[PDB]
From Swiss-Prot, chains A, B:
Fe cation binds at C9, C12, C28, C29. NCBIfam families: desulf_FeS4. Gene3D superfamilies: Desulphoferrodoxin, N-terminal domain. Pfam families: Desulfoferrod_N (PF06397). Nonheme iron protein possibly involved in electron transport. It comes from Megalodesulfovibrio gigas (Desulfovibrio gigas). GO terms for molecular function: iron ion binding. Homodimer. The keyword Kinase does not apply. To the N-terminal section of desulfoferrodoxin. This is Desulforedoxin. Its cofactor is Fe cation.
Length: 36, 36
């Protein structure tokens, strides 16, 4: 994901902002978080 | 996780901040992110 990017969990509605970018895929509730 | 909380992946260094709180556990590189 990228810096400044905002991700959401469609299962629980948790939302995060990417502060430091890295090559891993962000996961929550065992599903891929969705880029906003 | 809580609003304003910061999480990091110890494998790829990806750093996120929680904008909206949910009950799920944040995962990256298939591992639980660490609460900073």
């Amino acid at each position: 994901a990228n810096e400044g990017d905002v991700y959401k969990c469609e299962l629980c509605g948790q939302v995060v902002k990417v502060l430091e970018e890295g090559g891993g895929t962000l996961v929550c509730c065992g599903e891929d978080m969705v880029k906003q």
